[PDB]
Design a protein around this nucleic acid. Structure first.
Lengths: 52, 47, 57, 58
RNA sequence: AUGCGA
DNA sequence: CAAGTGTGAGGAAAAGTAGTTGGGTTTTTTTTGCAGTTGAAGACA
DNA sequence: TGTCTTCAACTGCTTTCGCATGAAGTACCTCCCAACTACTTTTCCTCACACTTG
């Protein structure tokens, strides 16, 4: 469905801890690639109190 | 309840769930201690 | 957030969805008449921004 | 989505309920369809905005 | 404002 | 081969209470018209 | 030295009159709340070993 293509289009959002390490100072490193592979939607449900 | 809490805080008392000693002295279930609010005053005056 | 946006119709985002307005996207199904209910789903709007236009072409 | 009128009535609904709308805070709202430029196809337009960009704009 | 009576 | 004093612990259960968690708002600290106007660059005497 | 001329940026407006029908900003943290299971708690109960006898 269209929405899974949309999240395939958002791609990644990367953030670096300036990933110290002590090229690792002008190329540094430690990549973190955050994305969303699948997106599922479930039909309306209601469970009582909270869980189980 | 909001009025009582606010007024007690204006006096500078500390209001929170009962301690083991407080629950025991007042005879309230320890499980209800955290729900049992107590107002106290200490040495170092409030700011 | 989609309940809110869907409850106001003020869809706003950092790209603007390439759309000329940030309101008017949502309508009450207004079941006062079955004719009105079906009429709602075959109604289409040129958009608020052209409602703002003074001309008639 | 797949209930026959009989079941649909068994669920206290208008035997013919088309649906397509949203219950938000209990108030029935639908998203109004909008007329937008036909996609992917170049539409030749003369617009004074184009001059509104600045000098030397046609 | 959305929609609407005139 | 046997009877008789002295006597400590083992055991049970409902409810509470423990530990761990989670939930949870509440809380709080896109030009699309108009007519004008100012300031502007440039020119001039 | 002094006067004139143009352009563009900015101001301010373009039905009335009523119903509607109000909604909605808000992140960091949370303590409270609801939960499952395990563990612990208060009162009570009943039997046991040993010493001494003949």
């Amino acid at each position: 469905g269209l929405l899974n293509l949309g999240v395939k289009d958002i791609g990644e959002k990367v953030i670096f801890d300036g990933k110290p390490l002590n090229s690792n100072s002008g190329y540094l490193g430690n990549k973190l690639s955050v994305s969303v592979e699948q997106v599922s939607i479930a039909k309306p449900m209601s469970n009582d109190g909270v869980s189980s | 309840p909001s009025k009582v809490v606010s007024l007690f805080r204006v006096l500078g008392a500390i209001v929170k769930g009962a301690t083991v000693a407080q629950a025991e002295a007042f005879g309230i279930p320890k499980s209800t201690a955290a729900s049992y609010k107590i107002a106290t005053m200490k040495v170092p005056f409030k700011l | 957030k989609m309940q809110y946006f869907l409850s106001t119709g003020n869809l706003v985002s950092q790209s603007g969805l390439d759309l000329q307005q940030v309101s008017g996207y949502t309508v009450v199904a207004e079941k006062i008449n079955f004719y009105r209910f079906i009429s709602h789903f075959r109604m289409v709007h040129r958009g608020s921004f052209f409602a703002q236009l003074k001309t008639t072409t | 989505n797949k209930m026959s009128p009989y079941e649909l009535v068994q669920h206290k609904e208008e035997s013919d309920e088309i649906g397509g709308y949203f219950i938000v805070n209990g108030i029935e709202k639908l998203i109004r369809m909008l007329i937008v430029q036909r996609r992917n196809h170049p539409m030749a337009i003369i617009r004074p905005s184009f001059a509104n960009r600045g000098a030397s704009y046609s």
